[PDB]
């Protein structure tokens, strides 16, 4: 297999860092805890090192390390994500919240040393001073959604778009739309996948012995083929 | 590799019946669902087959399957509920509410054909009917908390002590202290394990489609060690 | 403020007394010191009134007052064993030594006026003659390990079961597993702990001026919380 | 409490740095640790920087620092190390090694920030190449013995003598008689105490992982009054 899946074989640190920047309010995250890619389990916890999040947390919740889904035995000459590593790729990432602003994300998703590093710049605009975002806040959704994937043959990488269902204060919904564009670091033949999907399950919550702004963040992935 | 873990390489379908009785209101549920000791996942469903329940739903959470927490590679031996499966093993336990009543139940956990089976025998009492859970709206803690295993050589089985916040109206906080004792059914070999915890995550919900007085759990469970 | 911190505010005397029966040897020790709870400080020197020891010393460390440990303020509510002073406590151990023999031991620890004695009784059995115990000259580990404890509720107890690390003349490690039983010999109310540990850190030496099979015995016992 | 007692109520790191030569063998001699005068224990870790020792490690413990012994409540006012810090003290010797060589060490025991540093110079002299101590056939004492100390009036200090067995590897012991004084480095006032000695027991081990030429030293010393 490819020189990335055995870097994998167990549990492997994680390390988040976000640098963004929400209608002029600036501000920055960092991140840290586990992956277990044979389970698709992650287990993250991040803070606000700027002091309150100006955004609500489960917004950034998708922009905070997709090498961690579990690939079945089927399906391993299918996992791109892995397939760059160690040197890592890019994650590029447009969401579109439904009658709201748009986040721009930009990412670094590589190993430093024993550590898998998440350096994430984020840019937020066209937010309502009233609308969902910088307003009320909301909350994520603990059901198991599918995250499709394609490969981009021309930029050597892949392509992945996915819907997200925020649940509102008002029992409403809003629909963000992700697309996302991934790239290789390193120069060396990457995996080229066929059009599939990731089964994703996140739960929400807080650590009762935390007094600055946090997420604790639980996470299982598990990739699927498509017919 | 210990016989009782082939029996949870996939999801297994879950069978939950319970029979209470507190401060002389008799009461049934029904309960069903599947989990999977892969990831630790728990997703069940109750009835209150005899109409309103006269008890807070999240009162009822730990009594309504442990055989499905997720045991990492390193910890396997420490998994005395799969061992004792499919004789599977008998679950006592005294849940004392601080400053109000404490329940006495009664449970048989183990195989029925291909299901999993929950059958519990719930006695409360000394229940003051004008405190704050009786009659009233609880919320379940949500957040991570530990659940503390040791061996009982004397028993053949384990002892189970843990803590429960749960979350008054008022914003206050009533504290569920639980005495647990596993013992199996069979006379075959069981595990012994050393001192360890389970890290335990539910999340509550409503059935938008359910009439009847009912209960949707969402619950992830992963063991951890002691050094 | 239970009736039983009290009594360990200073230096306290000890008084030890354990008659042993192992591979039909039957032995006895005579042990005496002084235990300060403020520090967990234990000073106590062992002899062998019955001649040579038929089992080496090391081994006997476990089963020669716990009351000693010391409690921070945080913890004064957990203290088990001083709660149950001046009438005192039962002290039921098995003690399993991997691929030999084992320990069955039962102590009376209670205070006899001024002095906190310790009378024990250890019956042995399924100990090979050429086993790694047999033979003497053991090792014990002068670092600190953990020693957890539970609440027995139906027994209105505590149960403890720990793991120390013999090192053997071999280079090796024989590892003796610790199962023990706490139960008040008094009819008072005692402390109910939550799940907690004891780190506790003994160093083995000799008396140069002692001409009969002795040891002396430095130990410090602190308390400490489970999440 | 007395001025300087306030700097040893927790673990306090500590350095050692230590230039000999002995015979003209010149060597030098990194350590580090912490210390606990709470319970007088002591662990520390030396390393030769310059290679092999030329001398054994057992002739350089005490060379290799007192105001980490545990003075008991009542006998705090006779605690001269602790009442000569921040600033520290001058610890000079003279160790004579009977029917061969002698040691002269020069320490200054003070606190380099928070961290008590140990830094002294040692000159041996008229030992025997071919003796029992230059060819390394030399054993600690692992067994407790007394430290006796007693005030200087006229240099406003404490001189401190005592004996040190050593266990040669023919059987045979050899004495090191020790002879201390030691002075404030500061201009504050320094307790004065009466005689008294301290009870020290030591245990010198191997690092596994260690490959330079080392020591690692648990120690664990209290102070004790005479009548």
Known sequence: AYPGEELFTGVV????ELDGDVNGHKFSVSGEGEGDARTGKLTLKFICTTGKLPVPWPTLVTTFVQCFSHYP????????????????????????????????????????????????????????????????????????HNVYIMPDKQKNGISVVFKIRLDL??????????????????????????????????????????????????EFVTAAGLP
Request: hydrophobic share 35%; glycine share 8%.
């Open 13 to 16: 640190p994680i390390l988040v």
């Open 73 to 144: 035995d089927h399906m391993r000459r299918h996992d791109f994500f892995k397939s760059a590593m160690p040197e890592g790729y890019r994650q590029e990432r447009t969401i579109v919240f439904k009658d709201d602003g748009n986040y721009k994300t930009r990412a670094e998703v590589k190993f430093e040393g024993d550590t898998l590093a998440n350096r994430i710049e984020l840019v937020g605009s066209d937010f309502k001073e009233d609308g969902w975002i910088m307003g009320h806040k909301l909350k994520f959704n603990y059901n198991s």
């Open 169 to 218: 204060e008002d029992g409403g919904v809003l629909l963000a739309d992700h697309y996302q564009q991934n790239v290789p670091l390193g120069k060396g033949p990457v995996l080229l996948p066929d059009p599939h999907y990731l089964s994703t399950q996140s739960v929400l919550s807080k650590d009762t012995n935390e007094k600055r702004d946090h997420m604790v963040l639980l």
